[PDB]
Design a protein around this ligand. Structure first.
Ligand SMILES: *CCOCCOc1cc(C(F)(F)F)cc(C(F)(F)F)c1
Ligand SMILES: CC(=O)Nc1nnc(S(N)(=O)=O)s1
Ligand SMILES: [Zn+2]
Length: 256
């Protein structure tokens, strides 16, 4: 699978059939239609800089990975009775500056999107057990708005020199990805899926209502990454965002 025209989102179904399921992400959040739910506590993020393990190039994107064998870095709060464990964060972008984000709000597409992934440390014992589970994963989504260079991006953008080709991997230590979040964690939540394959309808989505800034050049650093393996040609990572999906009667809750 991939984001190319011959293996993209459109051919995913004729491959993974859940892509035409009932709980697909990303989606468009129509604000006139959200619901303030009163049982929604705020969201508390308690990450530890020293769980920061490595950065690695997975060919369609890159990931920053964390140590996930105790609740050292947790997502607590929101719609969650349980504490969720941080294990990864990563990004999404597009061909140009006007649509790299996966979620849209009110039909407004953003330049990129930040995803911060947790699994249910406390109902399940492993993340492979957790992946298929409707209540297994929790991802925070942060819209990215083209403007000023983000300072806290740099410390990770500075690290892609060392993972330029597909499979290339580098150590990445002392990082609090909470530093990447907006000042307000006012958010929406809806039940949804993973946005690329395996596409598991197992993600409880947290979408911060506040954007963060990324600069036009920082987005270019995203596309200086290579889909290919070393020695092979250069094919750069141009986009890796899925089109929005049908809500199919799902309810998007606001925390405000
Ligand atoms: C850059 C890659 O991220 C780290 C690996 O995260 C996952 C592992 C697994 C598996 F069960 F195979 F270990 C599954 C998932 C999934 F649920 F598909 F997101 C992520
Ligand atoms: C290993 C891994 O993380 N696979 C994913 N598949 N879809 C994801 S999404 N866009 O929720 O963040 S992550
Ligand atoms: Zn993602």
């Amino acid at each position: 699978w991939g984001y190319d025209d011959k293996n993209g989102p459109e051919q995913w179904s004729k491959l993974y059939p859940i892509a035409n399921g009932n709980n697909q992400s990303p989606v468009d959040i129509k604000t006139s239609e959200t619901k303030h739910d009163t049982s929604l506590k705020p969201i508390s993020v308690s990450y530890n800089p020293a769980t920061a393990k490595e950065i690695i190039n997975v060919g369609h994107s890159f990931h920053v990975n964390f140590e996930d064998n105790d609740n050292r870095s947790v997502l607590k709060g929101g719609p969650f009775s349980d504490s969720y464990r941080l294990f990864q964060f990563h990004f999404h972008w597009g061909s140009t500056n006007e649509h790299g984000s996966e979620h849209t709000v009110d039909g407004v597409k953003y330049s990129a999107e930040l995803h911060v992934a947790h699994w249910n440390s406390a109902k399940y014992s492993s993340l492979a057990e957790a992946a298929s589970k409707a209540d297994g994963l929790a991802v925070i989504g942060v819209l990215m708005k083209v403007g000023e260079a983000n300072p806290k991006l740099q410390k990770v953008l500075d690290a892609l020199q060392a993972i330029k080709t597909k499979g290339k991997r580098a150590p990445f230590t002392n990082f609090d990805p909470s530093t990447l979040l907006p000042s307000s964690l006012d958010f929406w939540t809806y039940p949804g899926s993973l946005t690329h394959p395996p596409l598991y309808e197992s993600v409880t989505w947290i979408i911060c209502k506040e954007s963060i800034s990324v600069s036009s050049e920082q987005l270019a650093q995203f596309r200086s990454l290579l889909s290919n393996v070393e020695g092979d040609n250069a094919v750069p990572m141009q986009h890796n965002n899925r089109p929005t999906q049908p809500l199919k009667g799902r309810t998007v809750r606001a925390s405000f």
